[PDB]
Design an enzyme around this catalytic site. Structure first.
Site, PDB file in Angstrom:
ATOM      1  N   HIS A   1       0.800  -1.216   0.000  1.00 19.59           N
ATOM      2  CA  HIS A   1       0.000   0.000   0.000  1.00 19.59           C
ATOM      3  C   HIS A   1       0.836   1.271   0.000  1.00 19.59           C
ATOM      4  O   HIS A   1       0.269   2.366   0.053  1.00 19.59           O
ATOM      5  CB  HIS A   1      -0.942   0.015   1.206  1.00 19.59           C
ATOM      6  CG  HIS A   1      -2.214  -0.738   0.985  1.00 19.59           C
ATOM      7  ND1 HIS A   1      -3.446  -0.121   0.955  1.00 19.59           N
ATOM      8  CD2 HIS A   1      -2.447  -2.056   0.786  1.00 19.59           C
ATOM      9  CE1 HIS A   1      -4.382  -1.027   0.745  1.00 19.59           C
ATOM     10  NE2 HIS A   1      -3.803  -2.210   0.640  1.00 19.59           N
TER      11      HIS A   1
HETATM   12 ZN   LIG Z   1      -5.004  -5.651   3.166  1.00 22.46          ZN
END
Ligand SMILES: [Zn+2]
Lengths: 96, 54, 90, 272, 383, 92, 45, 37, 129
Positions: free
Chosen positions: E151
């Site tokens: 992320h």
């Molecule tokens: Zn995740």
């Protein structure tokens, strides 16, 4: 609705009884006593008997007040996983 | 054939690291064995004390 | 000059051909405990072995003494330093 | 040839600025040590930083010598403005620029019961206690070897011995966290400084204190393990029952006479 | 219609095939806490490693320690200022770093904790060393459970992931491979790796995530790529409570088609533990065996593969599925008993190697699956 | 690696052959590899294979490094062309 | 755990020594061929 | 219901530790200032 | 404008050298499967049951390798030529880029006048014919 709810567990009772029979606790979990024998205290465990023949008996015990409604959910769950989820309101459905 | 000076020095450094790791493992294992032992002894002490108190 | 690294001291000793054994690594230094003396490295690096090693402080002091003792002359080194700087790409 | 002129001017400027024969000959000794493929370039720069620290231009010479307004590609991504596309990335190889995207960026287009929450709270407390205990145990493991070395080393070298940042451990911060926590995170500065500077007199004391703290926190963890066990006995299974909590409401709402009429009227309307 | 539900076959592994696996574990990985009330918990790697030690899997697998990634190596993706601030920041001096933290999207949803650089460097080094050993051909599988945090953007740390080691691992694999297929299983969309590799052909960033109201807000069926990376962004958005059988019926056709058309040389398979029943934020209902059938199918081909960790906001289930996958990687099936370890009391009241699905509304209608498979096949035939 | 000190084959706890210890704990791991006149001949073939394989690996690694640099150059040129074309398109 | 981590350390040491020996041999080869390149490219001028 | 936060060392022990180390090493006693930042 | 010229020049030299490399691969492509088969058969666990078989397999491997060195050394030679030619081409290319980008000079202005004459001469070669 009653017929289909009962069939959804009768169709897989054949494998559920085998899963219950083959269940074996690990040797080193009883020492930690996290295995709550409350189901064993009240006999709600399905070991040694057919699952359907116990679930209908427990439904009768609930309908005649023998067993508290609270314990029925766990009594069926710890033996049936969560594939017998629909028939918690069996008493009210039969009443209707 | 492993006779190189720099390669031999690096091999020695790596073997020193391996030996220190083996020493640290043994020390930590002994320490936590002792920790388990003292915890077990304290558990027995508390169990007997509660037995007598009851 | 103990603030330096092991590689610098080892290469210094190799270049100047000093007769001082290679310094013991910090982990190698801490290895030498009572039970740490039973390991292969410590049992083979303490007595009767020509591969014996010594602490980093003494080697650092020896190298510092040899570096301060070694006098320099600008004419010999500054052009050599410039050539090495302009040669490192090749 | 011309490049040598500015280099020699640099050298004479360094000689004038330093203003000391001893300092200059030490600096030139360091330069020669670099020239004999002994001193690393970064080590050389950091060493000469001591001499040439206060002259910005001279040290620089020496160092040299050695989001809606944007266009959118669909609903998700947007185009970066040019004034942001080129940003410092000094680790890139030749292929690190070819495949990696620069101008396109991501952009987003824009229920739990009360028992999974309790289970998660239990897990959070368990993780907190276990994390503290394990950090203390790792620090104790390192300080065990450190103290076993200290107790087998002659008094002559106890005073001048210094422990490098890291104490021989892979992590330079794990040993700091336990000391900060145990010593209230404020006065621990002095303790950690003393450990860095005076290992022989701090490592045994800190190791013993950490062992005592580890035993006490293990006692507390054993005490609260029973409570966590009991509170997880009766909540784990009902946590997995997402719809069973509202099953009574669903049954009482799907069998009403008004709903019974509506489920037929709407079906008839859809069929028509 | 392309999707076709099939019964879940039992686990089967080829006994003739031999696979080399190099498990990576840094003992100091599980000692940094994000905060008091933060879902992220690095302890799971340590518990999983303890499980693999206790199960006896060490006798059939190789395990090493990966050297921490240097700052320059870690800067192969992220900007210089981002890494500089990430190194310079401490939970005790953010008053003078407030503007930098605001710019870099850190502090509020992703907070600063001591040892942050150590954790990031450990994960990056694990990924880079796994990729390097994959290139050298010594080990067919390079398991790095520590990293997988996909992320992290180029200049922002969103979604509790500060450094994206998957990008660095893919880069070091691409230094010697033309095309590497990337597979995602995390519930959240892999925004970081997707954005990094959205304009390139040399990668296949296949994904299996869920579309709805979330933090990523990406992963549509429309996004397929720009430039030479067009139609090279396979996304399969899904919905609540996808069970084992339908997840397998979605995964196996798509992966088979990718291997038949894309023909990669190495696989970077994400194995996020937040796609399981009982997760803290993950809405899926996949069981552990369903979580491992995908890995077994990927392994059955016989090509070098780099398995990484990633998300997973619970500990016991994530550790159990990770050790089960590690065992399956060795063509060995792990028994349901969880042998005693220091962290045994964590593993629920069942104390069995299994995560069991819950009853959730399976919003994943077969029509949606057929439509998404048809779209994926249409955009995949162009490769 | 098979002909040298290192072990190309994977070694496990069974392969390490560490001696059993009862609380030999630090003992070195005994290992075995995969595999007058006649023994001298065998040694001659072993040495021959050894250094010829070293030469071959040397050559192949040099060739691979050369190809890596060439691909770096080609990628540089392609990136330059793409960037300038995108700039031109941005102009209009 | 003790047996496991002891074997783990031994495996790590073996991998490290193999990697370092390969690195040293490769560096020697690289320097040799760089020297050959420099000798060839110094005579052309 | 909620476990109290894990306790640090009591101040009466941190002062003893710092004073002991300062006196044995040779440092002056603990100053009466708090370097708050 | 030199960027265009070096972009034209890249593929021609690259392709000449790659064709040479393909020829070297061609003259030795029939021994790679044999060498791999010999190595795999040698590394079999059920092979050490006859010493003479080990000797003969080692002899076969040695003969194959003795035949295989020449192709490898020719590959090094052609790859070195590749590297130096590509180095020169990239040098020209990035000097061209730096010059073109530094200023968003009279010598390169003159070359336009010199080429303008050629363009003027070639345009009038059709009018005058
Ligand atoms: Zn995740």
């Amino acid at each position: 609705t009653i017929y289909e709810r009962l069939l959804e567990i009768k169709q897989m009772n054949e494998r559920v009884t085998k899963e219950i029979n083959t269940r074996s606790t690990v040797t080193f979990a009883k020492d930690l006593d996290l295995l709550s024998s409350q189901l064993s205290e009240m006999g709600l465990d399905f070991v040694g008997e057919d699952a359907y023949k116990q679930v209908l008996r427990l439904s009768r015990r609930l309908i005649n007040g023998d067993l508290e409604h609270q314990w029925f959910e766990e009594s069926l769950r710890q033996a049936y996983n969560n594939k017998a989820f629909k028939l918690y309101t069996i008493d009210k459905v039969t009443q209707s | 054939q492993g006779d190189n000076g720099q390669y031999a020095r690096q091999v020695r450094d790596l073997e020193e690291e391996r030996d220190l790791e083996l020493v640290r493992l043994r020390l930590f294992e002994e320490y936590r064995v002792s920790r388990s032992g003292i915890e077990f002894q304290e558990d027995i002490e508390k169990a007997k004390a509660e037995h007598e108190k009851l | 000059f103990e603030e330096y690294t092991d590689a610098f001291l080892r290469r210094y000793k190799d270049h100047f051909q000093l007769d001082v054994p290679d310094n013991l690594t910090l982990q190698g230094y801490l290895l030498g405990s009572k039970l740490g003396a039973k390991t292969y490295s410590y049992k083979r690096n303490t007595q009767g072995q020509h591969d014996k090693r010594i602490h980093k402080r003494d080697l650092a002091n020896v190298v510092r003494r040899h570096f301060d003792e070694h006098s320099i002359k600008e004419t010999d080194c500054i052009p050599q330093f410039i050539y090495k700087v302009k040669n490192q790409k090749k | 040839n011309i490049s040598l002129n500015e280099e020699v001017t640099f050298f004479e400027k360094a000689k004038r600025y330093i203003g000391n024969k001893h300092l200059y000959t030490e600096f030139l000794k360091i330069l020669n040590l670099y020239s004999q493929d002994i001193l690393d370039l970064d080590d050389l720069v950091e060493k000469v930083d001591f001499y040439l620290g206060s002259n910005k231009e001279l040290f620089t010479w020496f160092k040299n010598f050695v989001l809606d307004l944007c266009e959118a590609f669909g609903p998700s991504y947007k185009r970066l403005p040019k004034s942001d596309t080129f940003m410092p990335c000094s680790g890139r190889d030749d292929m690190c620029w070819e495949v990696l995207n620069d101008e396109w960026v991501g952009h987003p287009v824009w229920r739990k019961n009360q028992y999974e929450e309790t289970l998660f709270k239990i897990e959070e407390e368990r993780h907190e206690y276990d994390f503290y205990i394990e950090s203390n145990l790792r620090t104790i493991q390192c300080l065990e070897t450190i103290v076993n070395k200290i107790e087998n080393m002659t008094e002559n070298e106890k005073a001048n011995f210094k422990l490098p940042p890291g104490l021989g451990h892979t992590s330079m911060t794990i040993y700091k966290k336990v000391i900060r926590k145990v010593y209230d995170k404020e006065r621990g500065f002095e303790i950690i400084d003393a450990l860095h500077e005076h290992p022989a007199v701090t490592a045994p004391v800190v190791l013993k204190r950490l062992k005592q703290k580890d035993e006490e926190w293990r006692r507390a963890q054993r005490e609260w393990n029973k409570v966590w066990r009991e509170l997880e006995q009766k909540v784990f299974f009902k946590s997995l029952d997402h719809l069973g909590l509202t099953f009574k409401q669903a049954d009482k709402k799907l069998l009403t006479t008004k709903q019974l009429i509506s489920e037929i009227s709407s079906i008839k309307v859809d069929q028509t | 219609m392309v999707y076709e539900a099939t019964p879940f076959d039992p686990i089967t592994v080829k006994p003739s095939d031999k696979r080399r696996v190099a498990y990576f574990y840094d003992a100091d990985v599980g000692n940094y806490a994000y905060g008091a009330g933060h879902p992220m918990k690095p302890h799971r790697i340590r518990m999983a490693h303890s499980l693999i030690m206790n199960y006896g899997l060490y006798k059939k697998m190789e395990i090493y320690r990966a050297k921490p990634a240097t700052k320059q190596e870690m800067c192969q993706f992220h900007t210089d200022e981002y890494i500089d601030f990430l190194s310079r920041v401490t939970p005790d001096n953010l008053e003078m770093f407030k503007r930098e933290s605001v710019k870099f999207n850190v502090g509020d949803d992703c907070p600063v904790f001591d040892g942050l650089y150590e954790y990031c460097s450990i994960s990056g080094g694990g990924s880079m060393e796994g990729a390097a050993r994959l290139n050298r051909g010594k080990c067919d599988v390079a398991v790095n459970y520590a990293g997988g945090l996909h992320h992290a953007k180029k200049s922002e740390a969103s979604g509790f992931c500060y450094l994206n080691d998957i990008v660095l691992g893919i880069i070091e694999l691409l230094r010697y491979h033309p095309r590497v297929l990337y597979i995602d299983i995390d519930v959240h969309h892999g925004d970081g790796v997707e954005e990094a590799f959205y304009t390139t052909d040399r990668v296949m960033t296949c994904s299996f995530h869920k579309y709805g109201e979330f933090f990523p807000g990406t992963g549509e069926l429309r996004d397929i790529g720009v430039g030479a990376g067009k139609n090279y962004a396979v996304n399969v958005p899904l919905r609540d409570g996808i069970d084992d059988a339908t997840y397998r019926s979605v995964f196996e056709p798509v992966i088979k088609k990718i291997m038949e058309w894309y023909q990669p040389s190495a696989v970077v398979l994400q194995c996020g533990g937040d796609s399981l029943s009982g997760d803290r934020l993950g809405c899926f209902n996949l069981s552990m065996e369903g979580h491992a059938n995908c890995v077994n199918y990927v392994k059955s081909f016989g090509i070098p593969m780099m398995v990484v960790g990633g998300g997973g906001y619970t500990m016991r289930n994530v550790a159990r599925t990770w050790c089960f996958e590690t065992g399956l990687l060795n063509n060995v099936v792990l028994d349901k008993d969880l042998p005693y370890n220091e962290y045994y009391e964590y593993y629920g009241p069942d104390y069995k190697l299994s995560v069991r699905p819950s009853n959730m509304f399976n919003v994943n209608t077969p029509e949606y699956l057929d439509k998404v498979m048809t779209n994926i096949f249409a955009n995949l035939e162009n490769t | 690696e098979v002909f040298l000190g290192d072990h190309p084959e994977p070694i496990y706890e069974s392969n390490l052959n560490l001696p059993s210890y009862n609380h030999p704990f630090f003992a070195l791991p005994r290992l075995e590899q995969s595999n007058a006149a006649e023994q001298q001949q065998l040694n001659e073939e072993i040495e021959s294979a050894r250094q010829l394989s070293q030469i071959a690996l040397q050559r192949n690694k040099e060739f691979i490094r050369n190809l890596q640099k060439i691909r770096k150059s080609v990628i540089k040129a392609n990136r330059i062309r793409g960037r300038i074309l995108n700039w031109s398109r941005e102009y209009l | 755990e003790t047996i496991a981590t002891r074997t783990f350390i031994h495996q790590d040491f073996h991998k490290k020594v193999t990697d370092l020996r390969a690195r040293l041999l490769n560096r020697t080869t690289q320097t040799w061929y760089d020297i050959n390149k420099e000798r060839r490219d110094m005579d052309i001028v | 219901k909620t476990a109290p936060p894990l306790q640090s060392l009591k101040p009466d022990e941190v002062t003893e530790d710092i004073s002991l180390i300062r006196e044995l090493t040779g440092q002056p006693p603990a100053p009466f200032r708090l370097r708050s930042d | 404008n030199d960027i265009t010229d070096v972009l034209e020049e890249f593929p021609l030299a690259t392709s000449r050298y790659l064709t040479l490399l393909h020829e070297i691969d061609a003259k030795c492509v029939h021994s790679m499967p044999n060498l791999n088969e010999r190595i795999d058969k040698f590394l079999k666990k059920d092979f050490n049951k006859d010493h003479q078989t080990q000797v003969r397999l080692l002899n076969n491997i040695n003969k194959i390798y003795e035949e295989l060195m020449p192709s490898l050394e020719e590959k090094m030679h052609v790859s070195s030529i590749m590297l130096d030619n590509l180095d020169r081409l990239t040098s020209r290319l990035e000097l061209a880029y730096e010059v073109a980008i530094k200023n968003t000079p009279a010598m390169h202005l003159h070359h336009e006048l010199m080429e303008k004459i050629e363009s003027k001469s070639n345009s009038k070669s059709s009018q005058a014919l």
